[model samples]
Target: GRVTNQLQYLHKVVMKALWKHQFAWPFRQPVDAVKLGLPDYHKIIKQPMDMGTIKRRLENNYYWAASECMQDFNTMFTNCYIYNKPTDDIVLMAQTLEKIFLQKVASMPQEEQ
Candidate 1:
């Protein structure tokens, strides 16, 4: 019991710092792309959903919604890195996550969103 509490405390510390760092730049500034010779965040990509992954995750009854969100996040991040447009990717990922969240919430019974 004591060991579990200690582990939980350590986890809380790490997660707090990680979450703080993640919040630093929820979106990128326009100047971010200028230095890299990349085009600015222009538009969201259509059909950003990875249906195959979504299907498998839901079928397995895991954190399906979160898994789908992460897949979209990874896809957008990878694309942004290769294309050097952080704002675009972050924006797209946010949209995708919201979409996934709403869909999941709608499917639930009530008041759990």
Candidate 2:
């Protein structure tokens, strides 16, 4: 169907490359408050986001536009900044991921919303 729906294909390529990074471990999955013993995680990060969540959303056709997808990823990092210190290692990883995400979408064509 029209070369496999560019909108979906675009997100597929970008998201695959995102979680594939070595620094993506932190944001790859949802935080386990119960198992990890961090009860405050849920309270602080109310809208916590992870690559796994993003992947599922993409599969569900939840993203109508590229910006929405980009925003979700941005929110993920922004939440990290709120919970972690600027000197923290997790913060560094978020910075790396956010930087990569911005440029990732810049070059892609804006055919869909």
Candidate 3:
């Protein structure tokens, strides 16, 4: 009925860009990704993707996105600037985030589902 929905759709399209950053090899270290238990880069990047497929992938991989985002940021900051010591915080954060994501997904609007 209005341009509002178009803007909302655009937002979804824009949001996918963030998901792709997790697989940026030159930017995100492979070992850190492995440490965070992220999916193999081959699995993330080699998959054929279309708008519909990507939308579904984002939905299915929401927890991974949340976890990887948090861990990547935490790891990058702490490793590059702080003590550089190993920490188990990533695992705990990822686990709790997965649970939180599940709950939020369960409560999403019908259109989002």
**Tens digits of per-residue lDDT for model 2, 1-20:** 12224456455667777788
> After superposing candidate 1, which stretches have Cα over 4 Å from the reference?
1-18, 26-40, 43-64, 85-113
Model 3 segments more than 4 A misplaced? 1-87
Error of 3 at 95 (Å): 0.6
Give the true-structure RMSD of model 1.
14.6
Model 3, span 54-108: residue lDDT tens:
3443445432333333343344333322322246554443334344434443443
TM-scores for every predicted model: 0.27, 0.85, 0.26
Which residue ranges in model 2 land beyond 4 Å of their true spot? Answer: 1-6
lDDT of each: 0.38, 0.77, 0.36
lDDT for 40 in candidate 1 is 40
Candidate 3 lands at a TM-score of 0.26
TM-score of model 1 (CA atoms): 0.27
Predicted structure with the largest lDDT when compared to the true one: 2
Clashing pairs in 1: none
Candidate 2, run of 10 with poorest lDDT: 1-10
Best by TM-score: 2
